[PDB]
Amino acid sequence: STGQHPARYPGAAAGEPTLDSWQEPPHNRWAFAHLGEMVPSAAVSRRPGHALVRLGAIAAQLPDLEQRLEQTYTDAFLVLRGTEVVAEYYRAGFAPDDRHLLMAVSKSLCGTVVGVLVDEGRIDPAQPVTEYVPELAGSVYDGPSVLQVLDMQISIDYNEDYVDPASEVQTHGRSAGWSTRRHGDPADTYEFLTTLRGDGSTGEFQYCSANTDVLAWIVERVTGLRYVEALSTYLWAKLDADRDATITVDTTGFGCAHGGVSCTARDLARVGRMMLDGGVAPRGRVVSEDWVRRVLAGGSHEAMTDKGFTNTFPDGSYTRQWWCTGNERANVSGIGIHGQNLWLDPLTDSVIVKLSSWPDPYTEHWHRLQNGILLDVSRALDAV
Amino acid sequence: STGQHPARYPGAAAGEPTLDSWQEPPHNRWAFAHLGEMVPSAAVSRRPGHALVRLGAIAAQLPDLEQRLEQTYTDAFLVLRGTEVVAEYYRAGFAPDDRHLLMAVSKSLCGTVVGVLVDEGRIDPAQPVTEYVPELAGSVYDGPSVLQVLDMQISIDYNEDYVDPASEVQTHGRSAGWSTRRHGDPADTYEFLTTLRGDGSTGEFQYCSANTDVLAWIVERVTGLRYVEALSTYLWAKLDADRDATITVDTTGFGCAHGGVSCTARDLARVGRMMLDGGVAPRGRVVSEDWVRRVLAGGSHEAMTDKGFTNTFPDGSYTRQWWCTGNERANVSGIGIHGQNLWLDPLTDSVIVKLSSWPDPYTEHWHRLQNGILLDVSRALDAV
Ligand SMILES: NCCCCCC(=O)NCCCCCC(=O)O
Ligand SMILES: NCCCCCC(=O)NCCCCCC(=O)O
Structure with a gap:
């Protein structure tokens, strides 16, 4: 047995409802208001073909950036410098406020929720x-x-x-x-x-x-709390996000913490903004200054033996669900397969979001191109 | 074979992606932006226990209305008189802008889309x-x-x-x-x-x-068009709705036209408003004046032999995916199991939305109580 888990709704039996019981009482009062959690579902748009390209004042330094984004299967790209969106790109067919699967960038969000509970002394x-x-x-x-x-x-x-x-x-x-x-x-x-x-x-x-x-x-x-609710209460609801995020759930309603979150590029950037603001979000503190400091400091270098990561980032490491490059900019990033990054550039007080769909989950080829773009964009943000 | 169907995305093979292929190229570019269509998913709220009761100027005529709504497992209730929301109720735990499964009220939306295409001469x-x-x-x-x-x-x-x-x-x-x-x-x-x-x-x-x-x-x-897109293009996007609707989809991406739409109570009321406006919505005409007139006129009474419906509505009938009471008010309604109604009261230029979760799909007991409420509320809207 796996012990006690948060009920899907107040008073629910363990594991209820399932795909075969959601229409039955007492489950149906909850299920009728949350059916997407049980049955695959599509949006029917309330709104009635070309890429949106607003690369702003980095376009001059990176004239070929749009092509580089296309080549790395970019769906959404956004640069937040301080509190200002200074560059945006969305491929044809992907709207600025569309949500995109984060893959393991999801992990960095989960680690943040853990951090909150460490701050509270509820997790040691x-x-x-x-x-x-x-x-x-x-x-x-x-x-x-x-x-x-x-x-x-x-x-x-x-x-x-x-x-x-x-x-x-x-x-x-x-x-x-x-x-x-x-x-x-x-x-x-x-x-x-x-x-x-x-x-x-x-x-x-x-x-x-x-x-x-x-x-x-x-x-x-x-x-x-269900992880879905914890992710909202401890993180998402404090961001003043434009849209809800979503997260896939398994048959018990357990959210896929390791890979299943989707959100807009602009909203993901708010997570980075919180990290570069010492853990404070618009609606209150998310995590402590100390937690953020420890993320930015990096993990044990000795522990990091993944030659793929260290080939690019010799002094790189990993801590608290974040990848730490250990490069000269001390860049830190959430990373997901097929080209997802929540990339932090503290030097310029900037966050870069890149959400993509490479045909392959991860190869040295895509890794090289993706990191080349994130580094070039970071450097383009430097004072000159 | 069932012949040609609208591809899930531009260029997609028949039936692609499936639950087992959505992560693979070329599907993943679409799937990463629409994962809820493939895998059950929960909302992670961007917003940080008691019912909302605003029954307005019908409360005086129906002092026990809240209790009557509770007794019929009401989740959301809204009365639109003309363009004005004159009464609202939402149970504890259900927010005004939460979406609710429509069950077969969905059918009346589908019939409306068919009506548009009849107007265009594309369906005879x-x-x-x-x-x-x-x-x-x-x-x-x-x-x-x-x-x-x-x-x-x-x-x-x-x-x-x-x-x-x-x-x-x-x-x-x-x-x-x-x-x-x-x-x-x-x-x-x-x-x-x-x-x-x-x-x-x-x-x-x-x-x-x-x-x-x-x-x-x-x-x-x-x-x-995929039915999901047709429902948006021909109906939902013309309403100036607050939120997208959603619709369950089967393994081919086919939306469950007969029962699977969810939306907010206020947005569903916009469909009724369109019907009482002769088929015109804020962003343009949805269906013709003639189509609406034929819905309001009712179907063949001889055809209607369902003793359950006619026991309550002796002169009732059904046409174009709407139930027609044939009562003295000539009320017409979309109806779904467990207590869903999009109820039209042309006499008072009013729409009543009631979205519920009765423990049973349909019994004479719930039918009697539900229709009693809708009729009493309609009458409370009469000039005095
Ligand atoms: N099919 C389930 C996928 C779960 C998400 C996995 C994921 O996104 N992993 C990220 C790995 C990044 C590796 C970075 C590197 O080695 O340089
Ligand atoms: N389990 C699939 C349910 C599909 C929806 C069915 C539905 O909502 N039917 C409505 C029947 C209304 C009957 C009205 C009457 O007989 O008075």
Whole structure:
């Protein structure tokens, strides 16, 4: 068993409703107001073919930028310098206020929610995961600290290969409802997480999407809120965002913390703005100055042995669900496959959002091009 | 085979993407911007316990109205007199701008889209369904006219029993993605519709949700648009609505025309306002004066043999996806199970929206109470 989880609605039985029960009482009072959480659904637009190009005062320094964005399958691109939007691009067919899947940029949002609860003293990063989720006893998460989950420093038998059909990340996806279930698959994400094993070693970076969903599980046990609600209460609702975000949910209503958030480019930039404002958002403080400082400082360099990342960023690292380049600008970024970045450039007090759809989840080729653009744009923002 | 259908995106292969392919190119450029159409998803609120009660100047005439609304499991209630909102109620936990499933009030929206295309001469109601959807040859829809589909005057072996697990409406639901698929089930709604049979007789009213999805299929073949887009272009985008509507979609992206639309109470009222404005919406004409006149006039009384409806409304009838009471006020209503009404009161130039979640889909008990409220409210709007 995976223990207590936040009910889908007040008074709901465990795991209710399902796809087969949402029409029945008492579930239907909730379900009729939230049907998209149960059944795939399309928007019917209240509004009645060409790219929107407003690259502003970086266009002069980067004359070929639009072509570079097209070449990296850019859907939305936005540069926020201070509080001002100084450059924007949206491909034909993608509206400025359309939402876009964040993939693992989602992780950086989850880490932020954890940070809030650390500030409140409700989570102690030094404590074992099992202090908050006892039911992970006997799994690879039995022993490691919450900080080691935050920093992805746990050795896990989990192949995070995004193309291999046999990998654990595929099984993770089926458990999350991202793909069709196979016979024998875990019922939900919680169950899937309890199946994970490892050799027991910690301290070396291993990127694993399971870690983030463990963090969200911790958030749920500490707050009693569905992760979907926690993400709103502790982060999204404080941003004064233009639109709601969305997040995929599995059959229990558990939001896919590791990869399933969608939002507008402009609203994602508000998260970066909060980070560069020492953790304060328009409607109140989100996380502490100390938490932000620790994110910007980076993780242990020794732990970071991922040659892909370090080939580009020799002094790079990872902490608290953020990638830290350790470059001369000390850039830090949320990163998702197929070209998603929430990129922070503290030197110029700027945030760059790039949301894309590369044909491949991740290759050195796309990595090189994507980071080349983000660095060139950052530098174009420097005083001259 | 069910023939040509509108592609999910420009250039998409038939039936693509599926739950198992949306992450792959070329699908992912579209899917990353529309993931809720593939995977169940929750809203993450941008906004940070008690009912909202603003019953205005009908409260005096109906002092017990709030209790009557509670007793009929009312989630949202709104009265529009002319252009003015004169009464509103929303239950605790349901916000004024929350969306609510319409169930078969959805049908009246679909009929409106058909009406637009009849006005344009792109659909001739006198023509057989097969003039527009040849692939329905050999089915119960081989022979009947489009008008007979609009008026639900086709005898079909289809048990529209909302509680019986064995009924065709359940199989319809599985084909639409509302419930878990069983082995042997049709792949999608189009395929399901082609399996339907009947004795060949027409002319007598038989309420059947399959009819509305046939109408949406016709709309798609005539316009080349996904029904989701047709519903927006021909209706929703002309209303100047506060919010997008949503509609559930099956595995091909086909919107559930018969039951799957959700929207706010205030926005649904804009549809009624359009009907009482002779078919004109704020952003342009939706349907012709003649179409609206024919809806308000009612269908053939002889055809209406449903004792449930006629027990309450002896002179009642059905036409063009609207229920017509034939009462002394000539009230006409869209109706959905569990207590959804888009109720028109032309006498007072008023629209009443009631969106509910009765524990039962439909019983004489709820029917009596619901119609009692709508009639009392209508009468309270009369000059005195
Ligand atoms: N199919 C599920 C996908 C879950 C999201 C995974 C994701 O976005 N991962 C980001 C990996 C970035 C790697 C950065 C680097 O190695 O340089
Ligand atoms: N489980 C799928 C439900 C599809 C919607 C059906 C629906 O809303 N039907 C309305 C029936 C109204 C009957 C009115 C009357 O008989 O008085």
